[PDB]
Each structure stands twice: as structure tokens, then as C-alpha cells.
Amino acid sequence: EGTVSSSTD
Amino acid sequence: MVVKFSYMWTINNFSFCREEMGEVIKSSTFSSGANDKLKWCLRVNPKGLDEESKDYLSLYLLLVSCPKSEVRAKFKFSILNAKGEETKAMESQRAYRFVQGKDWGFKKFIRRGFLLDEANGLLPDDKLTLFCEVSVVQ
């Protein structure tokens, strides 16, 4: 569910 | 398929200390099977980092302690309401690789306005209660 990301991008 | 555990994070004075939160705040280190397993942590941005998520609250799960090898795990984030039930759950459909100091999560986790709405009942006593569910595979 929903788009996953990271905070290093 | 190896170890599945959970952690509940209650953030007191969400609106009252909004200025004191800052850009990012991180929860206390949590881990189950402490003698066997490795330390985790939860990071949240009250306001988004960029213009795409500036109206959203971003939530991430980060690995703190250096593992012996690469760690792959799924995670499920939800918000506990006034009655302690899961709401607005958001889970990664697949697992992701974790190394020391690496985080994974959702930039648009919940709309910041939907959170502050009195009708949703998400902030009782000005407390945002989050629930994380990790499923480590190895």
C-alpha cells in the first residue's frame, strides 16, 4: 500500500 | 519468515510541541529478541522535507546497530486511534535491504490536515500514537 521511499535520496 | 515483532510509539504533545519537534525526530531504540537480534528505530518528519510532501507527515524505519550482514525486512505502519485500533495502515508490499544508518518508509504517509482533524480522532490528549510491525527475513 502506497509508494515507499527513503530519506537518503 | 524469521522474526516478526512490533513497536508502539506515542508522541506526546504533537501540536503543542510542533515547534519543538523540528525537521526530524527519532523514537527510542527498539528490538525484540534483544540478545539474538539488532537495534531498530523510528524516524518521523512532522512536515515533509520537500514540496511534494510539505502537506504530509513522513515516517521511516531505520536500522541503528551494525548487523553482521545485509538485513531484509518488511514493515507496516499504522496510526492507533482513540480506541486503540489501527487506522490509515500503510505497508511495504515487498521487503527492502537494510544496512546501518539506512532507512525506508513513506514520504506521503498521512496528510497532515487529515491528522489534525478532530473528526478522525487520531490525536487524543494531543498524542499521536504510531504502530510499527517489522517482519525480518533471513
Numbering used by the authors:
A (entry chain C): 196 to 204
B (entry chain A): 28 to 165
What does the article say, verbatim?
The SPOP gene encodes a substrate-binding adaptor subunit of the CULLIN3 (CUL3)-RING box 1 (RBX1) E3 ubiquitin ligase (CRL) complex. Geminin and its binding partner Cdt1 are essential for the regulation of DNA replication. Here we show that the CULLIN3 E3 ubiquitin ligase adaptor protein SPOP binds Geminin at endogenous level and regulates DNA replication.
Proteins bound by SPOP usually harbor a SPOP-binding consensus sequence (SBC, Φ-π-S-S/T-S/T where Φ is a nonpolar residue and π is a polar residue). The C-terminal segment 199VSSST203 is the only putative SBC motif in Geminin. We also determined the X-ray crystal structure of SPOP-MATH domain in complex with the Geminin peptide 195AEGTVSSSTDAKPCI209 to a resolution of 3.4 Å. There are two copies of SPOP-Geminin complex in the asymmetric unit. The Geminin peptide electron density is detectable for each complex, within which we could fit nine Geminin residues from Glu196 to Asp204. Consistent with our NMR data, the peptide lies in a shallow groove across SPOP surface. The binding mode in SPOP-Geminin is similar to those in crystal structures of SPOP complexed with other peptides. Geminin Val199 sits in a hydrophobic pocket formed by SPOP Phe102, Tyr123, Trp131, and Phe133, while Geminin Ser200, Ser201, and Ser202 probably participate in a network of intermolecular hydrogen bonds with SPOP residues Lys129, Asp130, Gly132, and Lys134. The Geminin 199VSSST203 motif contributes 8 out of 9 putative intermolecular hydrogen bonds between SPOP and Geminin. In contrast, there were almost no changes in the 1H-15N HSQC spectrum of SPOP MATH upon addition of Geminin SBC-alanine mutant peptide, demonstrating that the SBC motif 199VSSST203 is essential for SPOP-Geminin interaction.
